[model samples]
Target: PAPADLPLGLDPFCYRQFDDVTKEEFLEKVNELVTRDAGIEFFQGYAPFCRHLYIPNFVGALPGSLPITADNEHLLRSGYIARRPNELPVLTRWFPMSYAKDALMPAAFLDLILYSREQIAKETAAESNTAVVIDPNAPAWSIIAVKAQNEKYSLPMAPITMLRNTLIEGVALDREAYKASVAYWKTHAIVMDKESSLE
Candidate 1:
């Protein structure tokens, strides 16, 4: 008999788990983050031209350390407050630039940061009290600080995912489109400092 081939696969249980109390604590922290006006610029990059649109509302942040699960692999969590009138509010997630140094191509990541800043400047150049100055390296430092804190207690480091939701019908939540849009921005949007001084 011919030798049988073996299937190549990875283990399914390779991820950290959180208990109910811990989960609640996480949610509470997220709630606090969403409600606070940290002056974080939530920029929306629209398609067809990928315009860097600045949304003045800071809704929520998503953690990148979430366990990679079948259901959540494609899910970018959103802020609870959803806009009405049947629309999909686009969300933007930010990861440390250092993260790209490990697994992602630096060329693509650097390009995104450039494009996002150019578009933002072009869009807001003529406006007064709306000029946003972004430091591409700022997010890395911020995330590193948080990551160190999270490591102390084995908690997840938060990704700067600015979620702006519109609760028209929970049924209208298109996770695939949301995921696609996020990737698009990841490749095209520029990095901005959440605490950057606005001119």
Candidate 2:
């Protein structure tokens, strides 16, 4: 099918659809667009991100041209992270959500912090061996099993008793941090429009 004809004076948000093209074609077109009112009058108004954010696509609407596409359809995967610590061999790999004030996120957030701290402690135990490292939870083994799984997923026998004590006290467990984080995202939210062919 032919490309849909976008109306004149289409804004930056409108420049979302365009197939891959040669470097020559891209420069020529980008250059060409700057001149025509059919394109950005100054090129400064153009926002090329829309076309790129098909990113990993996983979308039938815009399939990825992988193995490194040379054309203008750049591969820019969103999210995720890669970390290389110093001369580290292993590559470290890793959301922006603004939760409501009374949301259930606090408990979830606390758990996430708990698990992450557990991982750090395990790592430290491995780096420097000790008697505690003998524990299955320690990294003494090549493939350390998950603490919960190794311990047969221990559950609080008292159950439901700590529900009230799960409260965040001052200093060590700060509710202020949550309030600060929630406010940060709520204020900085920039909900952009989705790229669409349909008007």
Candidate 3:
């Protein structure tokens, strides 16, 4: 089920649906686990593109082709994050993307999202004292992971352009920064699992 206070212009169908779990239930389960181990809060929000490409049918939705807003939320995924006050948050991976298999393993992916979230969280925390940012809940990991994954996949020209254009406009991606960040994360990636303890 959608949130009681779904934001304006957001599409309810844009979220990932589970056969056996409601979105709220899923989030509750995840948050409970992470909070128990990591002392973090989890939030559900928008993404720029669909993880599975099954929703909104990407027939004509080439990367930069869509308007890329809350209105096109169905074209995106329902972003989730593990957040802590004064600390960066970590987002989950897009499992269905073609390049997922070759990209940084789960270990590195987790770290990258966590690090990126930290940067944004710090910025948001700073902004809160004076004013509000445009969107505090942006998908930090999804943006970085999409760009990082393509490196190993080395997608074709059209697809590469699509990724670049989409990420740039969709999430205001910073290529050089993400490139360096991905490289750094690649070097320091570490394993994490329910048993590993995020704390």
Candidate 4:
């Protein structure tokens, strides 16, 4: 029988389990590490496009070192706050660049999505074809609505209700379309930084 295809966006570098730790312990350890090493103190500010985002508001960092379940059960752990599906705060707020616009704009955003989807598809295909697999129940879709929601809510924002309303409307209208709009703003939006820098 042919193997099942793996999901897109699955990280090959990520491990399923460590030598001697329950999934909870491992996740707790990871939370500790994130708070210690990659805590908010290290960042100048949250990404610019969505400067309102923050880690603590949305996600509790892993403790130190632990393995994550294939289904990302670590997210439901006490340390982890579960948001809406397909709404991981990291996706909207965490920027590889210094600011959010770099990643949120159309060309970059679509490109990123395309690149990610391609890699995910490839990985999924590979897993499906493999003969010896550790866990057959790997995730097929990397980001779901719930995860996306969690990400969206991770940051604290003023006018919280209004922000939520806008986001809800945007997400409801069409997630892909709303994302594309965000990308458009990255290029076309006139964002002024605290230093009065405009982009």
Best by TM-score: 3
Model 1 C-alpha lDDT per residue in residues 30-136, reported as the tens digit of each score: 33443454442223234332312122222222222322335433333323221334445334333333332343321210001012333344344443356665545
What TM-score would you give candidate 4 relative to the actual structure? 0.20
TM-score of each candidate structure, all chains considered together: 0.20, 0.17, 0.22, 0.20
Whole-model lDDT per candidate = 0.28, 0.22, 0.29, 0.28
Candidate 2: tens digits of C-alpha lDDT, residues 85-174: 332232111111111112112111000001122333444456556322333332211111111111111212111112223535212334
Stretches off by above 4 angstroms in model 1 are 1-46, 51-111, 114-122, 125-127, 130-175, 179-199
Please list all clashing residue pairs in model 2, or write none if there are none.
Answer: none
- Give the winner by TM-score: 1 or 2: 1
The candidate that achieves the highest lDDT relative to the unseen native structure: 3
> Candidate 2: TM-score?
0.17
The stretch of ten residues in a row with the least summed lDDT in candidate 2 is 106-115
Off by over 4 Å in 3: 1-12, 17-24, 41-163, 166-175, 181-199
Which residue pairs come into collision in candidate 3? Answer: 14-74, 49-76, 88-117, 88-118
Candidate 2's C-alpha lDDT? 0.22
Candidate 3, run of 10 with poorest lDDT: 52-61
Per-residue lDDT over 105-167 for candidate 3, one digit per residue giving the tens place of the 0 to 100 score: 432111111223343444445755544343546433221211222122122222223234454
